[PDB]
């Protein structure tokens, strides 16, 4: 049960520096090769660089020369990636990954991946979302099935995450990819189809998390008598 | 630097068929002192990090089923997925770890081609009273679990066709029924919303025999 | 400690002296040339045909500190006209495959099974890390828990030139545990 847990998403000003952490659980990373891999919006995977924490040695892609520093804190088993002089093109999900040693290399088996950290390079300020219900009704009822949801409006930067009933409701959920509005703020919605007979007795709550603004909202979505 | 290249860029195949994904390196990644190809394959599902499938070009990671098979040597490599299942929809990536800078292919998107269409179930949501206190009305039209992905959603406000004030979002292909879902959001000021009565979304899709309209009257229920 | 792909030749055996009929009392033993954390055995001036040949030239690499890069240079056949025409290096799959001592004999072993965590990269300075490029290299880890001794052979004793025979080169890498 080795687990890599990364630091939260952030917006950073153009020209500034970001430090992304990656902490290993299930023990130390002292026999692991750590890679940092980024994925820009709509693009393939791109190797940023790597460090073997035992060896203290680091490799970097030519694109990141003089701008990226890998460090480790072996006491806390946390790896860090610092990217300076940030450019618009550096907007990406940054992953840390770990590989165990075999056959003379620390990079043959990168099976452990962090969840990813979205770094948004922008001058626009952090804004938390408002959460609005999409109430079930007769105009949202088909057969014995109703739809309901939550509209997560006007936040920056990405991402928000949504669960239903603290994760106890997963079947029939669609959480849509965010849309960038003409205002330059994001919005998304998350919907679920439920039995129409469940509407008077079962509570439906969307749990909305926007880590860049420390926004945590639970919203009960209530039926109309309609 | 070693350049990695995958082909095809995208693959759409039926359930039970065999998917073949090729990957070429610009130099050999076979080390003659251990006879190993320094080549890995990853599977990436939407919202998730990549997951290691194959390493040393042909060794399966723990838990990966035998339908996934890596082959090839030197500069030419192939990932084969036999008997395609609905949960195999993902982007597949090859990577060399022979020498720094490590490099990836561009990714291969694999999707399921369903034999038959599926019509969306269609739902419309009026703006909540709480959103109206913020001065904006969002009207949401939901198209649930349809195939193929192509769909037309048109907004009518008092039977006037709307343009320029709506945005759509579409999910990735579902890992169970290989359908898509779609939202269209109409955005109006609260003042414009309160001047009009009939709000309708009209949905055209191959699964529907003719276009379907869902509507409400503002203030009525 | 071995995966499902790695094989060695378990039939292969040799000795330190090989076919030279030189006893171990008569070996020319010397230390590797050590600059910072790079320890080098260079055989390009040790193995050419000489009057007293074949001699045994034994290069001793002694490790007891972290992160030592060991580098071994063996002259290629045809790199000089005539003088290395019958040179042989053992194991052919060095440095991934090395020789260790089994009851006075030398037999094949995987270096990865001997030393956990060491670096054996497939290329060094854009050339394959194999004696067919004339040089091999590996880097020892920050912590070694188990003692090991292993060998490489660079043998020119079958090269003859003007009634002289080349010499047989031996590398002995002695790793003592460190970093505990
Ligand atoms: Na000996």
Numbering used by the authors:
A (entry chain A): 1 to 52, 52A, 53 to 82, 82A, 82B, 82C, 83 to 100, 100A, ...
B (entry chain B): 1 to 27, 27A, 27B, 27C, 27D, 27E, 27F, 28 to 215
C (entry chain C): 553 to 732
What is the paper's account of this structure, in its own sentences?
Pfs230 is essential for Plasmodium falciparum transmission to mosquitoes and is the protein targeted by the most advanced malaria-transmission-blocking vaccine candidate. Pfs230 is a 363 kDa secreted protein containing 14 six-cysteine (6-Cys) domains and is important for gamete adherence to human red blood cells and subsequent oocyst formation. Transmission-reducing activity (TRA) by antibodies elicited in mice has been found to target the N-terminal region of the protein, and the clinical Pfs230-based candidate immunogen contains the first 6-Cys domain of Pfs230 with a segment of its N-terminal pro-domain (referred to as D1M, amino acids 542–736). To elucidate the structural basis of antibody-mediated inhibition across a range of potencies, we determined the crystal structures of six antibodies in complexes with Pfs230 D1.
The second mAb, LMIV230-02, was identified in the same study as LMIV230-01 from an individual immunized with Pfs230 D1 (Pfs230D1M-EPA/Alhydrogel), but unlike LMIV230-01, LMIV230-02 showed negligible activity with only ∼59% TRA at 1,000 μg/mL in SMFA. After generating Fabs, we determined the crystal structures of Fab 15C5 and Fab LMIV230-02 bound to Pfs230 D1+ at resolutions of 3.3 and 2.0 Å, respectively. Notably, the epitopes of both Fabs are directly adjacent to one another, with Pfs230 residue I672 shared between them. While both Fabs were bound to a discontinuous conformational epitope on Pfs230 D1+, both epitopes primarily consist of loops proximal to the C terminus of D1. We hypothesized that the low/absent TRA of 15C5 and LMIV230-02 might be explained by their binding to a Pfs230 epitope either fully or partially inaccessible on the native protein. Indeed, similar to 15C5, LMIV230-02 was also previously shown to be incapable of labeling the surfaces of live P. falciparum gametes in immunofluorescent assays. Fabs 15C5 and LMIV230-02 overlapped with domain 2 in all the theoretical models, suggesting that the epitopes of both antibodies may be sterically occluded by domain 2, which could contribute to their lack of potent TRA. Further, non-functional mAbs LMIV230-02 and 15C5 elicited from Pfs230 D1 subunit vaccines bind to epitopes at the C terminus of Pfs230 D1. Theoretical models indicate that these epitopes could be partially buried at the interface between Pfs230 D1 and D2 in the native protein, which explains their lack of TRA and clarifies the deficiency of LMIV230-02 to recognize native Pfs230 in immunofluorescent assays.
